[PDB]
Amino acid sequence: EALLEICQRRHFLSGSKQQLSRDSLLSGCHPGFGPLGVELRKNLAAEWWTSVVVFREQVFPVDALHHKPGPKLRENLLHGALEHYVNCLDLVNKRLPYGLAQIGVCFHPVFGVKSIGEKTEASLVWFTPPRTSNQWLDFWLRHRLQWWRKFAMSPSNFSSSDCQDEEGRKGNKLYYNFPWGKELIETLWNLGDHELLHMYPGNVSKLHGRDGRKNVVPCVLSVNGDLDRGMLAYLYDSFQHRKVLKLHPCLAPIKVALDVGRGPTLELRQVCQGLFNELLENGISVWPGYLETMQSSLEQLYSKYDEMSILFTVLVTETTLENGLIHLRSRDTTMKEMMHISKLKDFLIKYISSAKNV
Amino acid sequence: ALLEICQRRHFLSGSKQQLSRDSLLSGCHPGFGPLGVELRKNLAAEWWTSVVVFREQVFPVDALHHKPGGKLRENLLHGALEHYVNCLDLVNKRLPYGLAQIGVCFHPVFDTKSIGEKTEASLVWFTPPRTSNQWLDFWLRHRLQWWRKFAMSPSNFSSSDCQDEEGRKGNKLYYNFPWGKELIETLWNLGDHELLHMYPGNVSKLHGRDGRKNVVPCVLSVNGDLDRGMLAYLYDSFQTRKKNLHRKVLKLHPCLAPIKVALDVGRGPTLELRQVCQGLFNELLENGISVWPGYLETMQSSLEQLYSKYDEMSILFTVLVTETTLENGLIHLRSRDTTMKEMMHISKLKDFLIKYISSAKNV
Amino acid sequence: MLSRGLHEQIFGQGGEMPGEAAVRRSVEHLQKHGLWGQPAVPLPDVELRLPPLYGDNLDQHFRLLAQKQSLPYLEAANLLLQAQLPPKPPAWAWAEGWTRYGPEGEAVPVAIPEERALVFDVEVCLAEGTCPTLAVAISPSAWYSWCSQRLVEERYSWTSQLSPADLIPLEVQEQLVVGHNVSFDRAHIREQYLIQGSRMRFLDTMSMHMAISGLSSFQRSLWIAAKPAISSWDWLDISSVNSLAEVHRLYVGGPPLEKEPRELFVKGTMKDIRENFQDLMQYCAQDVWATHEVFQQQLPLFLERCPHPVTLAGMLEMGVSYLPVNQNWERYLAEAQGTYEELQREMKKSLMDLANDACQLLSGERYKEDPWLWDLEWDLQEFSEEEEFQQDVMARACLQKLKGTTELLPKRPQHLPGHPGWYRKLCPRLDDPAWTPGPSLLSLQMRVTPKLMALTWDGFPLHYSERHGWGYLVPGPYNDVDIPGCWFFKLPHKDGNSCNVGSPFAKDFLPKMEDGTLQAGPGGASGPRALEINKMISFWRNAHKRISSQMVVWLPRSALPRAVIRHPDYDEEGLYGAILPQVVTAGTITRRAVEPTWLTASNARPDRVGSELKAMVQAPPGYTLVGADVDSQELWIAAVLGDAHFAGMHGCTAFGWMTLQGRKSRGTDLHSKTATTVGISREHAKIFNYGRIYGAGQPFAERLLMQFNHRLTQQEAAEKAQQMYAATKGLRWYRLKGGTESEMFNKLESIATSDIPRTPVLGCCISRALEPSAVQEEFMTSRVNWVVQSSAVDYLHLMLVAMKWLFEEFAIDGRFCISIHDEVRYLVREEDRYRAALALQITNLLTRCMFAYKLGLNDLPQSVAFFSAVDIDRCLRKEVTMDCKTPSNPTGMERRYGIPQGEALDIYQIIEL
DNA sequence: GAAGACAGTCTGCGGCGCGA
DNA sequence: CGCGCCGCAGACTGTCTTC
C-alpha cells in the first residue's frame, strides 16, 4: 500500500489524486508517471528492444500511428505491421522468419461514461513458415522467458501457460505474480492465413513469401507484452524494516548521485560539475542532487537517494580535495568506502557491464 | 528534388507509397519505419542532453494525452503548468526554473477535418521579470546552435522575431525546405497570464523567491517539432550540378544517424566467419552501438551496390570480416563520410567507435 | 534673391555690390567647358528673422560669442601657467578619495579639488579591467592625489558605478583640465558620464602637439626610424612623437623622462602594483610634471598660433562627445560575438565537409582528374536453449601477433593509416586529451583551405612557396592560363607576373568577395557558404577587440534626468548608459579628431556580423539624436575656396556649379551622379573624388583605381591621363595648377606656402614641421590636405560655437555634440527637436556665411545655405529609414525611423512658445 | 643497424596599434 | 604610414623509440 506513496514522493510515479487505486495504474487511466518513472519506462523499453530487436538479426522495428487512419484511438499495432509486411518481404529480401516489433502507446476502454486510457505496450508480429510456424512461436516462448530473468529479482514470479482458441491453435500467455495478485503481462497468438485474407482480398501472390526457395504463406505470431504493467510488476518484485527498492541497475533511472558536504563550496561545486559532465559524455546517468542548501541530515539524504532507484551514492568532502578520495556507498551492499574521483567512471562502467552481462 | 525514392527503398518513411510534401508536413502521415523511429529517438535524447541534464534547475515533466478540464491534447504547456506547483515545491523556491517534455500531440488539420500527430518538445522556463529577456535570448540562441549542429547546411535553419496580438514579443524558428520556409519552433514570453488563468484563486502561493523580496514569475514557452525536424534533417543530408561526380549519399550526423555500424562477411568460402561476426555483434550492442546484420544477405556478387545502399541509410561505418580475421586479425573498415578502406584489429574497434561518437557529440 | 539662387541676406544689410568685371569673368569661365545655362528650379524663399548679431558683422559677432564662451577657461589656463609650485612631495598617502599634501607634505582628506585648473593624469590596471588605479594631479597650489579604492579587499562591484574619480563640486565658475590625451582621462571622471551638459572643458597637450609642432604619420614613421624620399631632415628637431617623454624632451631641455621598466599597469596584476605603489606613483607624478611643463611651454605658443577665439572655443567643444546607449548595447555585443562564434564553427564544419568530399574522390581515382586539389601528397600508406557455437571467447583467441608497435608509435603521424597525407596531418593526433573527429585542425590560414571554398578561377601561379601570394586571378611553362589546369609548376616562369609583384597587404581582398571574379565552387553547397561566412565575419574579426570593452559606464536611476523619468518609456530594467568616445581632438596632423572605433565610416551594411555599431547608439527615452550630415562639407569648402579666390562668385568655376546645381536624384551630383558617369563603377568613384580632392596625388588615385577593379598599368595610366583632361591639371605654373581647371587647387597650395597665417576662416597655423619657412616638403600633399581638413575643423568649431550660443540664449536642452566624419548629432531632447532643427539650419547658414565672409565673397547660395534634411532619429544611422543584419531588423528593436525634415519649419519661432 | 616519431626551431605573412 | 611584437603556418630537425 505504501509502495505507491513512496514512488509518488520520490518522483517515481505521478500524482495519486486521479489514480490512487492500483486499478488506474494497471489500466490506461493512470494520471501519468513521474520523471523517475518515465526514465525507468524508457530504460525498460530500450533494454527490451536491444534484447529482442537489436539482439535479433532478422528482426527490425516498426512504427504504428497512435490513432487509427481507418478505411478512433488505435487498439493494437499488429495491423500496421501486417500492412507493411507486403513491402518488407521485398525490402528484407524474402525474410520469411523475420518480424516487426514496436513499443508504443495504445488506447483501451475503461468502464457511467466509459473513458479511453492510454497504456504503453510492446507488440511484435513475426512471420514464420507454416512447416515450423508454431515451433517458431515456441522459440519466442523461450526468448520472452529469458526477459523474465533479464532484470527480475525473483525469476520464479514469472509463469507461463498454454491456451487455445478457434483463431489460434497454439498460444502462450505469461503472468507475473504481483503482491496484490497474479496479472497477465504477456500474451501470444498464432494466426494463420485468415488475417492475410481479411487484410488482402485474394492477394495470394503478395501474401506468399520466399522461404527456403519455396513459396509459402507466412503464419503471423503476435506477442503482446505490457511495458507499463511489466515495469510495474518488475518494480514491485524489486521491493522486499527498511523500505528500499533494489531496482535493476540497467533499468534504474539514475545510476549514481552527486552530493556536496564537508568541504569548500567552490571546490565541491567544481567537482560535482566535472563528475556530471563526465557522466553525460560517457553515457552514465547522474542524478543532479547537488546545489542543495537545506542539509537536513545525512540519513534523510541517503534514504532519498536509495528510494530514487540510485545504484550508488557519491559524497564529495575534504578528502576529495586532499587525496581525491570521496565516499561511495552501495545500496545493495549497505556498505560505504572511499573511492577515487578518476576511478569513479571506471567503477561505474564495470558495474554497468556486470549488470548487463549475465 | 524528388528524393523520396530513397525513403521508399529504405524505411525512413511511412507505409504509404505516395508522399507529397503536403502529406509529410501535414502530420497526418500513416507512420514511420524503424529508421525513422530510431532517428526521432536520437533527436529526443540529444535534446534532453542539450537542455535538461546539462543545465541545472531543469527537470523533465509529463503531460497526459487528454485534458479532463475527453479530447486529445493540443499543446504540452498545460501539463507543465499543472505540475508547476510541485516542481517548484521540490526545489528550494528558486524562481529561475525549467521544465522539459517530449511527446506526441494530435492537432486538427484542414485540407481540401483530419487529425494529425506530431512530436512536440516543450521547454517551460519560469524567470524573474528582469532576467526574462536575457534568458529568452539565451534559450533561442543555444536552441539555434542545437539546430545548426546535426545539419550539413545550417543556413537553411533560421529564426525570426515577431510581436504577439497581445503585445508580447516572441520568436519563431524555421527551416528553409526546398519548396519553402517551414516553421519548426516557436517562443512565447508571457507575464504568467496562463498560469494565473489556471490558478486565479490565490496569487501569493504562485510567487517565487528571487531574493529578499518575492516577485510574480514570468513564463517562457519554447515549443518545437521533431517529425518535421526529422524530414528537415533527411532533406538537408541529401545533396547536384557541375560536380561531375554523382553519388546518392545521406550524410546524417553521427549523433543521430539511425544505424551506426554495419557487419558483413566476405566471399570466403571458408565459412565459420558467422560466429566471429556474431561475437563482434554482441560486443557492439553491449556498449550501445546499433549494428546492421548485413551478413545474412547473400548472392549479390557486388560490394559496391551494398555500400551504396548502406550509404543511403546513412550507416557511418561498414565492417567486413574476411578469411584473414581468424589469424592476423584485420577487419576491413569503410567510413561513410569518406569512402576509405582501412584494416583494423578486432580489439579497440569498439572503443574507437565509442570515441568517435563521443567526440562528434562534443563537437 | 533669385539672382542665381541666394536669398534676402539679413546679415550685412547694404552693399551687395556684384562687380561687373567679376561677374563677367565668372560667366565666361562657367560657359566655357561647362553648363551655366540650367533650368535652375527656384527653392521656396525662407521668410525668417535671424537671431540678433551682437557684433558689427559676422566675424565680430562670432569673435564675441567665442570670447564669452572661452574667457573663463583661458584665464584659468593662464592662472595655472604662471602659478608658483613646490616640488613633488616625498611620499604619498594611503587613504581613499582625494588628498592634497602641500605644507611639508601635510596630508589632508580633501573631498574635491576645489580649483579651476588641473593636469590630473591617470593610470589603470589593464589586466584588472578598465577601472582607474590611482591618479596624480597638479592643481596650481599644492599637488593632489586620488585613490582608486580598488586596492582594498572585497568591493568587486562591476557596471562602473562610482568607480570613476570625482573631479567637480556639487555647485551648491567653470573648470579646466589638461593632459597628454585628456580624452583618455575624460572617462574616469564620473561627472563627464552625465547626459546633461558638463561645465568643464578639457585640453589635450597631444591636441596642441598636433596643432603646434606636430608630425604627419607618414612623417612620424620617418621620425621614429631616424630617432626623392630624402628630406631636408630639419623638421625632426622641432617636432616630437606625440609621447609625453618625447614631447617633454622637445619642449624643454631637462633630464629625460623614463618609461616604467616593468610596465606594471600594462602587463601586471593588482597585487604587483601594490608592491610597487610608491615607485609607480612617483613615475605618475613625473608624468604629470612633464605634462604641466609642456603645457606651460605650449599654451602661449598655441594661442599665438591659433589666436582666433572661435577655434579654441570649438576645441574646448568636441572634447565633450557623448554617445548614449542602453542594455541593447550589451545585447548587441553578446549577439554579435555569439554569431561570430557560431559562424566560425559553421565555416569550420563546412571546411571539414569539403575535406570529406575531396577524400571521397580517390575511391574511383577521381582526385587525379580533379582540376584542383591535386597538388597534395594525396598518397596511401599500405599499413532450444542452445548457446553460441563458441561464444565471444574466440575474440580472446584472436589477439594480435605484436604488430601494434606499442601505443605511442601508431598515434601522432601513423593514425588512420592509408588516408591521404593531408587528411592525416589535419586529423588531431590520437595522443590528445581532447580528440575531435575529421580534419578538425583545418583553418583559413592553411594551404588546404584556399584550395576548396576559395577556388575562384584557380589562380594559375597560386601554387604558393617562394613569393606565394595572389597571382593572375584573371586572363591576359604551359598552363599559364588554362581551364583544364594541371599545371607543371616546374618554376614560376609562366607568361605573366607569376608572383606578388604589387604586394598589397592592408586588410584587403574582402571587398573583392562581392563579385570581383573571386568566388567559391558552385558545385558544392557548403563551399560558397563558407566564403560568405568569412565575408560576414571579417569586420567583426577585425574590430571586436575595440568594439568590446569600450569603457561603458551605466548611469544609475539617480544620475538620469527627470526627462527620462515620468516618461512613457521610463523606468524598465534596461541599463541606461553612456560612452565617452575617448576621442583625441586633433588626432591627425590636421585638427581632425581621431577615434578608431566611433569616428569611422561604419556603413552598417548588410552581410556583416559586426555592423550596426553606429546604429542603436540610442538617445535616452525623451531624447532624439537631432543631427545633420553636412551636405558635401569638404566638396563645398573646396568649391567656395575656389569661388572666392577667382572672381568672388559661387558659380565662377564649374566645381562650384556642380556642387550645388547637381542633385542626388536625377541630377548631376559630383558623387554617384557624375563621377560614375565620367568614371567607372559606383560608390568607389565617390571615394576617388574624395581622395583626389582633400589631399592626394595622381599615383595615389591610380593605385586606388587598381584597388577598385582589375586594370593594366598602361590602361590605368591612360585613364588617369584622360582624367586630368577637364580636371584641375595640377602642377602647371606660369598660368595665373593651370590648364582646364574646373577645380581650384590653387587656393590650397597658395595658402599652404603662406608662412605663419595658414587658415582663411579662423587663422590657425599648421605645425612647425611641414611649414615652409624652415623646410620645403618634397611632396606637398600633406599641406594641401591640411588646408581643407583644418577648414572643415573650423567649420565644426563654428557650428559648435553657434549651437552653444543658440542653446544658451534660447533654452534648448541636451547640448551634446556627437560629431563623426563631418556629420553632427546633438541629442537635443524632445519638444525641442524642431526648434533644434531650426537651430541647426540657422547654424549652418551662419557658418557658411562666415566661411564666405572670411574667405572673400558676401553672398551665399540657397542650395547650400540650409541642410537638405535634418535627421531627427532615436539612433545614429546614415539614414532615417535603415535596417541591420545580425538582428531580425531594427523594428525588432525599439527603433521606429523618424523624420528627415527640411523646409518643414512648422515651429517658425526659434524662441520658445 | 634502419626507419618513424617528436617536441622544439626558424621563417613568413597577415595585422594591430601605438605614445600619458 | 608603417613598423616591430605576435601569432599562428609550414617546413625543418637532432634525437628518442621500435623492430
mmCIF file with all atom_site columns, N, CA and C in Angstrom, chain C residues 87-126:
data_model
loop_
_atom_site.group_PDB
_atom_site.id
_atom_site.type_symbol
_atom_site.label_atom_id
_atom_site.label_alt_id
_atom_site.label_comp_id
_atom_site.label_asym_id
_atom_site.label_entity_id
_atom_site.label_seq_id
_atom_site.pdbx_PDB_ins_code
_atom_site.Cartn_x
_atom_site.Cartn_y
_atom_site.Cartn_z
_atom_site.occupancy
_atom_site.B_iso_or_equiv
_atom_site.pdbx_formal_charge
_atom_site.auth_seq_id
_atom_site.auth_comp_id
_atom_site.auth_asym_id
_atom_site.auth_atom_id
_atom_site.pdbx_PDB_model_num
ATOM 1   N N  . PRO C 1 87  ? 58.100 71.541 -5.216  1.00 0.00 ? 87  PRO C N  1
ATOM 2   C CA . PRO C 1 87  ? 58.451 70.257 -5.839  1.00 0.00 ? 87  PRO C CA 1
ATOM 3   C C  . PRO C 1 87  ? 57.511 69.138 -5.416  1.00 0.00 ? 87  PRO C C  1
ATOM 4   N N  . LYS C 1 88  ? 57.742 67.930 -5.922  1.00 0.00 ? 88  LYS C N  1
ATOM 5   C CA . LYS C 1 88  ? 56.867 66.815 -5.593  1.00 0.00 ? 88  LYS C CA 1
ATOM 6   C C  . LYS C 1 88  ? 57.005 66.465 -4.111  1.00 0.00 ? 88  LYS C C  1
ATOM 7   N N  . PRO C 1 89  ? 55.968 65.892 -3.492  1.00 0.00 ? 89  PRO C N  1
ATOM 8   C CA . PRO C 1 89  ? 56.087 65.517 -2.086  1.00 0.00 ? 89  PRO C CA 1
ATOM 9   C C  . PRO C 1 89  ? 56.999 64.315 -1.926  1.00 0.00 ? 89  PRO C C  1
ATOM 10  N N  . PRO C 1 90  ? 57.537 64.086 -0.724  1.00 0.00 ? 90  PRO C N  1
ATOM 11  C CA . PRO C 1 90  ? 58.416 62.921 -0.542  1.00 0.00 ? 90  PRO C CA 1
ATOM 12  C C  . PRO C 1 90  ? 57.682 61.596 -0.619  1.00 0.00 ? 90  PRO C C  1
ATOM 13  N N  . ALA C 1 91  ? 56.497 61.491 -0.018  1.00 0.00 ? 91  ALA C N  1
ATOM 14  C CA . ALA C 1 91  ? 55.706 60.269 -0.036  1.00 0.00 ? 91  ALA C CA 1
ATOM 15  C C  . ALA C 1 91  ? 54.232 60.617 -0.161  1.00 0.00 ? 91  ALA C C  1
ATOM 16  N N  . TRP C 1 92  ? 53.459 59.668 -0.683  1.00 0.00 ? 92  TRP C N  1
ATOM 17  C CA . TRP C 1 92  ? 52.034 59.840 -0.914  1.00 0.00 ? 92  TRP C CA 1
ATOM 18  C C  . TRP C 1 92  ? 51.220 59.108 0.148   1.00 0.00 ? 92  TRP C C  1
ATOM 19  N N  . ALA C 1 93  ? 49.953 59.495 0.256   1.00 0.00 ? 93  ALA C N  1
ATOM 20  C CA . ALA C 1 93  ? 49.070 58.957 1.276   1.00 0.00 ? 93  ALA C CA 1
ATOM 21  C C  . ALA C 1 93  ? 48.564 57.573 0.877   1.00 0.00 ? 93  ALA C C  1
ATOM 22  N N  . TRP C 1 94  ? 47.702 57.015 1.732   1.00 0.00 ? 94  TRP C N  1
ATOM 23  C CA . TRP C 1 94  ? 47.114 55.703 1.515   1.00 0.00 ? 94  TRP C CA 1
ATOM 24  C C  . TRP C 1 94  ? 45.626 55.650 1.836   1.00 0.00 ? 94  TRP C C  1
ATOM 25  N N  . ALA C 1 95  ? 44.994 56.784 2.128   1.00 0.00 ? 95  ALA C N  1
ATOM 26  C CA . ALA C 1 95  ? 43.559 56.823 2.350   1.00 0.00 ? 95  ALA C CA 1
ATOM 27  C C  . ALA C 1 95  ? 42.817 56.893 1.016   1.00 0.00 ? 95  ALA C C  1
ATOM 28  N N  . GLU C 1 96  ? 41.504 56.684 1.079   1.00 0.00 ? 96  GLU C N  1
ATOM 29  C CA . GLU C 1 96  ? 40.671 56.723 -0.112  1.00 0.00 ? 96  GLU C CA 1
ATOM 30  C C  . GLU C 1 96  ? 40.464 58.168 -0.565  1.00 0.00 ? 96  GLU C C  1
ATOM 31  N N  . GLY C 1 97  ? 39.690 58.334 -1.639  1.00 0.00 ? 97  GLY C N  1
ATOM 32  C CA . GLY C 1 97  ? 39.323 59.659 -2.101  1.00 0.00 ? 97  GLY C CA 1
ATOM 33  C C  . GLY C 1 97  ? 40.517 60.463 -2.589  1.00 0.00 ? 97  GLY C C  1
ATOM 34  N N  . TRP C 1 98  ? 40.440 61.775 -2.372  1.00 0.00 ? 98  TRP C N  1
ATOM 35  C CA . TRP C 1 98  ? 41.478 62.717 -2.764  1.00 0.00 ? 98  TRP C CA 1
ATOM 36  C C  . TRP C 1 98  ? 42.279 63.161 -1.546  1.00 0.00 ? 98  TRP C C  1
ATOM 37  N N  . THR C 1 99  ? 43.528 63.547 -1.794  1.00 0.00 ? 99  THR C N  1
ATOM 38  C CA . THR C 1 99  ? 44.404 64.118 -0.780  1.00 0.00 ? 99  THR C CA 1
ATOM 39  C C  . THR C 1 99  ? 45.262 65.195 -1.430  1.00 0.00 ? 99  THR C C  1
ATOM 40  N N  . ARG C 1 100 ? 45.724 66.142 -0.610  1.00 0.00 ? 100 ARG C N  1
ATOM 41  C CA . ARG C 1 100 ? 46.306 67.385 -1.100  1.00 0.00 ? 100 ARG C CA 1
ATOM 42  C C  . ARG C 1 100 ? 47.775 67.575 -0.750  1.00 0.00 ? 100 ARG C C  1
ATOM 43  N N  . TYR C 1 101 ? 48.214 67.167 0.440   1.00 0.00 ? 101 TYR C N  1
ATOM 44  C CA . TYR C 1 101 ? 49.580 67.409 0.918   1.00 0.00 ? 101 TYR C CA 1
ATOM 45  C C  . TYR C 1 101 ? 49.784 68.918 0.994   1.00 0.00 ? 101 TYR C C  1
ATOM 46  N N  . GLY C 1 102 ? 50.860 69.474 0.435   1.00 0.00 ? 102 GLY C N  1
ATOM 47  C CA . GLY C 1 102 ? 51.097 70.898 0.453   1.00 0.00 ? 102 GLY C CA 1
ATOM 48  C C  . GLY C 1 102 ? 52.190 71.301 1.428   1.00 0.00 ? 102 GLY C C  1
ATOM 49  N N  . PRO C 1 103 ? 51.823 71.876 2.589   1.00 0.00 ? 103 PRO C N  1
ATOM 50  C CA . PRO C 1 103 ? 52.863 72.358 3.508   1.00 0.00 ? 103 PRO C CA 1
ATOM 51  C C  . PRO C 1 103 ? 53.622 71.218 4.168   1.00 0.00 ? 103 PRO C C  1
ATOM 52  N N  . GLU C 1 104 ? 54.868 71.007 3.745   1.00 0.00 ? 104 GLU C N  1
ATOM 53  C CA . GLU C 1 104 ? 55.705 69.927 4.269   1.00 0.00 ? 104 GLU C CA 1
ATOM 54  C C  . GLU C 1 104 ? 55.056 68.563 4.059   1.00 0.00 ? 104 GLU C C  1
ATOM 55  N N  . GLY C 1 105 ? 54.310 68.412 2.968   1.00 0.00 ? 105 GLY C N  1
ATOM 56  C CA . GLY C 1 105 ? 53.631 67.156 2.695   1.00 0.00 ? 105 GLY C CA 1
ATOM 57  C C  . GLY C 1 105 ? 52.594 66.783 3.730   1.00 0.00 ? 105 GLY C C  1
ATOM 58  N N  . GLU C 1 106 ? 51.891 67.764 4.286   1.00 0.00 ? 106 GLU C N  1
ATOM 59  C CA . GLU C 1 106 ? 50.894 67.513 5.325   1.00 0.00 ? 106 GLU C CA 1
ATOM 60  C C  . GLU C 1 106 ? 49.616 67.020 4.659   1.00 0.00 ? 106 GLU C C  1
ATOM 61  N N  . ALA C 1 107 ? 49.368 65.717 4.746   1.00 0.00 ? 107 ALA C N  1
ATOM 62  C CA . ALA C 1 107 ? 48.187 65.135 4.126   1.00 0.00 ? 107 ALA C CA 1
ATOM 63  C C  . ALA C 1 107 ? 46.919 65.658 4.787   1.00 0.00 ? 107 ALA C C  1
ATOM 64  N N  . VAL C 1 108 ? 45.896 65.893 3.970   1.00 0.00 ? 108 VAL C N  1
ATOM 65  C CA . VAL C 1 108 ? 44.594 66.351 4.448   1.00 0.00 ? 108 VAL C CA 1
ATOM 66  C C  . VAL C 1 108 ? 43.519 65.657 3.615   1.00 0.00 ? 108 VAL C C  1
ATOM 67  N N  . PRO C 1 109 ? 42.480 65.050 4.224   1.00 0.00 ? 109 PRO C N  1
ATOM 68  C CA . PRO C 1 109 ? 41.483 64.345 3.386   1.00 0.00 ? 109 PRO C CA 1
ATOM 69  C C  . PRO C 1 109 ? 40.530 65.289 2.655   1.00 0.00 ? 109 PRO C C  1
ATOM 70  N N  . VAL C 1 110 ? 41.019 65.859 1.559   1.00 0.00 ? 110 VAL C N  1
ATOM 71  C CA . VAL C 1 110 ? 40.194 66.715 0.714   1.00 0.00 ? 110 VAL C CA 1
ATOM 72  C C  . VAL C 1 110 ? 39.239 65.844 -0.088  1.00 0.00 ? 110 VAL C C  1
ATOM 73  N N  . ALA C 1 111 ? 37.994 66.299 -0.219  1.00 0.00 ? 111 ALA C N  1
ATOM 74  C CA . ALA C 1 111 ? 36.978 65.551 -0.949  1.00 0.00 ? 111 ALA C CA 1
ATOM 75  C C  . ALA C 1 111 ? 36.864 65.967 -2.410  1.00 0.00 ? 111 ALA C C  1
ATOM 76  N N  . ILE C 1 112 ? 37.371 67.142 -2.771  1.00 0.00 ? 112 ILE C N  1
ATOM 77  C CA . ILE C 1 112 ? 37.204 67.680 -4.119  1.00 0.00 ? 112 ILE C CA 1
ATOM 78  C C  . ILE C 1 112 ? 38.383 68.597 -4.428  1.00 0.00 ? 112 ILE C C  1
ATOM 79  N N  . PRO C 1 113 ? 38.997 68.526 -5.624  1.00 0.00 ? 113 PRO C N  1
ATOM 80  C CA . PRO C 1 113 ? 39.976 69.559 -5.991  1.00 0.00 ? 113 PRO C CA 1
ATOM 81  C C  . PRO C 1 113 ? 39.306 70.882 -6.334  1.00 0.00 ? 113 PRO C C  1
ATOM 82  N N  . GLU C 1 114 ? 39.039 71.693 -5.311  1.00 0.00 ? 114 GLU C N  1
ATOM 83  C CA . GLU C 1 114 ? 38.261 72.914 -5.480  1.00 0.00 ? 114 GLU C CA 1
ATOM 84  C C  . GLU C 1 114 ? 39.089 74.041 -6.089  1.00 0.00 ? 114 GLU C C  1
ATOM 85  N N  . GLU C 1 115 ? 39.680 73.798 -7.258  1.00 0.00 ? 115 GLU C N  1
ATOM 86  C CA . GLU C 1 115 ? 40.357 74.833 -8.024  1.00 0.00 ? 115 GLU C CA 1
ATOM 87  C C  . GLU C 1 115 ? 40.133 74.566 -9.504  1.00 0.00 ? 115 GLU C C  1
ATOM 88  N N  . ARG C 1 116 ? 40.241 75.627 -10.300 1.00 0.00 ? 116 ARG C N  1
ATOM 89  C CA . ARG C 1 116 ? 39.786 75.629 -11.681 1.00 0.00 ? 116 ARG C CA 1
ATOM 90  C C  . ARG C 1 116 ? 40.890 75.286 -12.673 1.00 0.00 ? 116 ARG C C  1
ATOM 91  N N  . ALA C 1 117 ? 41.894 74.520 -12.259 1.00 0.00 ? 117 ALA C N  1
ATOM 92  C CA . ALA C 1 117 ? 42.966 74.128 -13.163 1.00 0.00 ? 117 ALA C CA 1
ATOM 93  C C  . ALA C 1 117 ? 43.665 72.900 -12.607 1.00 0.00 ? 117 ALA C C  1
ATOM 94  N N  . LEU C 1 118 ? 43.837 71.888 -13.454 1.00 0.00 ? 118 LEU C N  1
ATOM 95  C CA . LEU C 1 118 ? 44.462 70.634 -13.052 1.00 0.00 ? 118 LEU C CA 1
ATOM 96  C C  . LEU C 1 118 ? 45.105 70.004 -14.274 1.00 0.00 ? 118 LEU C C  1
ATOM 97  N N  . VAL C 1 119 ? 46.056 69.096 -14.047 1.00 0.00 ? 119 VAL C N  1
ATOM 98  C CA . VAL C 1 119 ? 46.516 68.221 -15.122 1.00 0.00 ? 119 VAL C CA 1
ATOM 99  C C  . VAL C 1 119 ? 45.883 66.844 -14.974 1.00 0.00 ? 119 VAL C C  1
ATOM 100 N N  . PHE C 1 120 ? 46.059 66.211 -13.819 1.00 0.00 ? 120 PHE C N  1
ATOM 101 C CA . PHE C 1 120 ? 45.287 65.027 -13.449 1.00 0.00 ? 120 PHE C CA 1
ATOM 102 C C  . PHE C 1 120 ? 45.480 63.887 -14.451 1.00 0.00 ? 120 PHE C C  1
ATOM 103 N N  . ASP C 1 121 ? 46.708 63.380 -14.509 1.00 0.00 ? 121 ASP C N  1
ATOM 104 C CA . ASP C 1 121 ? 46.969 62.151 -15.242 1.00 0.00 ? 121 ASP C CA 1
ATOM 105 C C  . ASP C 1 121 ? 46.421 60.960 -14.466 1.00 0.00 ? 121 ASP C C  1
ATOM 106 N N  . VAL C 1 122 ? 46.119 59.884 -15.194 1.00 0.00 ? 122 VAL C N  1
ATOM 107 C CA . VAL C 1 122 ? 45.535 58.682 -14.618 1.00 0.00 ? 122 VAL C CA 1
ATOM 108 C C  . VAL C 1 122 ? 46.245 57.461 -15.184 1.00 0.00 ? 122 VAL C C  1
ATOM 109 N N  . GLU C 1 123 ? 46.316 56.418 -14.360 1.00 0.00 ? 123 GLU C N  1
ATOM 110 C CA . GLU C 1 123 ? 46.858 55.129 -14.755 1.00 0.00 ? 123 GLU C CA 1
ATOM 111 C C  . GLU C 1 123 ? 45.917 54.035 -14.273 1.00 0.00 ? 123 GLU C C  1
ATOM 112 N N  . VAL C 1 124 ? 45.758 53.002 -15.098 1.00 0.00 ? 124 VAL C N  1
ATOM 113 C CA . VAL C 1 124 ? 44.797 51.936 -14.851 1.00 0.00 ? 124 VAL C CA 1
ATOM 114 C C  . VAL C 1 124 ? 45.497 50.591 -14.975 1.00 0.00 ? 124 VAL C C  1
ATOM 115 N N  . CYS C 1 125 ? 44.916 49.579 -14.335 1.00 0.00 ? 125 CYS C N  1
ATOM 116 C CA . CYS C 1 125 ? 45.405 48.208 -14.423 1.00 0.00 ? 125 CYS C CA 1
ATOM 117 C C  . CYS C 1 125 ? 44.694 47.526 -15.586 1.00 0.00 ? 125 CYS C C  1
ATOM 118 N N  . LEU C 1 126 ? 45.410 47.345 -16.696 1.00 0.00 ? 126 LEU C N  1
ATOM 119 C CA . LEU C 1 126 ? 44.786 46.806 -17.902 1.00 0.00 ? 126 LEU C CA 1
ATOM 120 C C  . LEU C 1 126 ? 44.280 45.386 -17.680 1.00 0.00 ? 126 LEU C C  1
#
